[PDB]
Structure 1
Amino acid sequence: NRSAVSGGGRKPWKQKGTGRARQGTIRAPQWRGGGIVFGPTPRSYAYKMPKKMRRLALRSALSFKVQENGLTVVDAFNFEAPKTKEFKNVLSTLEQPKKVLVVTENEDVNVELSARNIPGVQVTTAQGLNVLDITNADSLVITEAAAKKVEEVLG
């Protein structure tokens, strides 16, 4: 702003005596190199919503996913080593689209190490289900234990 710019303390010329516009500083907005009035300022954009309304925003997303036949249930993932090719094959066998979201009952280290370099594939836990992730994904793959945990913990 006007005070932040360096210099511009004196008065460029006297108030009257010559034919020129009256000026007070060399850093006024109309000048070239002066301060900016009503620009952007650092702040935050986050805000909150009642707790009862957050639960409805997730159940609605899950229901919208299940109406379009985009929710399938599989057994556990007994991966012994992180292999991307094996996950690609099991995705092809299940006949899943390019975008897919898979949940696990806890943080599965072997499942998470794989499938994290294939475009359009993301992994979340049962507790940390997002609203953006469910809407963004094209198909949902859930394990039965994680499905029960979601049914119980989530209302």
Structure 2
Amino acid sequence: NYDVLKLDGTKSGSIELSDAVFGIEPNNSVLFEAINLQRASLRQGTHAVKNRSAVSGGGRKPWKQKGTGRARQGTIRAPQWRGGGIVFGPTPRSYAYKMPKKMRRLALRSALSFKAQENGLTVVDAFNFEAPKTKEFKNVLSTLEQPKKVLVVTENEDVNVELSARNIPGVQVTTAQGLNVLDITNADSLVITEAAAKKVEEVLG
């Protein structure tokens, strides 16, 4: 209930502002219907086959009936020919359901409370640099040490932090109102500015 603050290599003054959003015991089965939701929503279902109707040809009736001594076969493009016609193909559809608006926040206050209640969180003070230098950020990730998967969060925008750190494998730079739930449990280390940390309890609680 008191997260310690660092700035760019140096300890400084810290806050306690982690009360209800950071500290709930994580309700795991709420998360499993939220991590499954988004990843079954990213993808554009666009896949079709042409069934027995829309193939070309087939008005002929090849054998007649009685007399010839073959099957009672009907057209040329029935499914059991080597021609087309597929009886049960994939209809182009959409993969999208929704949870109610209370459950839709209770996963997200459970996702980052999985970070803070056990093994891993860090709040840094803000940091600006005008010219986009990738090397001046890979420098920073190894001082205050994080593993390969790491998530930085600006308060509403960043003309450089959104535009640096876009080359390194394992880094995502997300504005604090774009906080989804897959990446925040895909990562292992939240490193956030101190300006947005006061806002996320003022917007999720």
State the TM-score, normalizing by the size of structure 1. Answer: 0.97
- 2:84 & 2:189 partners in 1: Cα distance? 55
- 2:190 & 2:118 partners in 1: Cα distance? 11
Provide Cα deviations, 1:34-76, integer angstroms capped at 9, x if missing partner: 3000111100011011000011000100110112331101111
Q: In 2, are the aligned partners of 1:100 and 1:120 still within 8 Å (CA)?
A: yes
Provide Cα deviations, 1:77-119, integer angstroms capped at 9, x if missing partner: 1112111111011111101111000111011011111111000
Q: Residue 18 of structure 1: CA displacement?
A: 1.6
Q: In 2, are the aligned partners of 1:26 and 1:34 still within 8 Å (CA)?
A: no
SS, match of residue 152 in structure 1: helix
Q: Name 1:3's counterpart in structure 2.
A: 53
Provide Cα deviations, 1:104-139, integer angstroms capped at 9, x if missing partner: 101101111111100000111111101001110010
- 1:66 & 1:7 partners in 2: Cα distance? 65
Show structure 2 runs of 5+ residues with no match.
Answer: 1-50
- Backbone CA RMSD of aligned residues: 0.9
- Say whether 1:73 aligns with 2:123: yes
SS, match of residue 103 in structure 2: helix
- 1:107 & 1:59 partners in 2: Cα distance? 22
Q: In 1, are the aligned partners of 2:77 and 2:83 still within 8 Å (CA)?
A: yes
Show structure 1 runs of 5+ residues with no match.
Answer: none
- 1:124 & 1:47 partners in 2: Cα distance? 24
Q: Residue 24 of structure 1: CA displacement?
A: 1.2
- 2:195 & 2:84 partners in 1: Cα distance? 64
Q: Name 1:154's counterpart in structure 2.
A: 204
Which has the higher mean CA deviation after the structures are superposed, 60-69 or 116-125? 60-69
- 1:92 & 1:69 partners in 2: Cα distance? 18
Q: In 2, are the aligned partners of 1:74 and 1:144 still within 8 Å (CA)?
A: yes
Q: In 1, are the aligned partners of 2:151 and 2:187 still within 8 Å (CA)?
A: yes
Equivalent pairs counted in the alignment come to 155
- 1:32 & 1:96 partners in 2: Cα distance? 58
- Say whether 1:134 aligns with 2:184: yes
State the TM-score, normalizing by the size of structure 2. Answer: 0.74
Compare relative contact order (CA 8 Å, sep 6+) and give the higher one, 1 or 2: 2
> 1 or 2, which has the higher helix percentage?
1
Q: In 1, are the aligned partners of 2:63 and 2:70 still within 8 Å (CA)?
A: no
- 2:74 & 2:68 partners in 1: Cα distance? 15
- 2:151 & 2:196 partners in 1: Cα distance? 13
Q: Name 2:81's counterpart in structure 1.
A: 31
SS, match of residue 123 in structure 1: strand
Pick the structure with greater CA Rg.
1
Q: In 2, are the aligned partners of 1:74 and 1:143 still within 8 Å (CA)?
A: yes
Q: In 2, are the aligned partners of 1:80 and 1:110 still within 8 Å (CA)?
A: yes
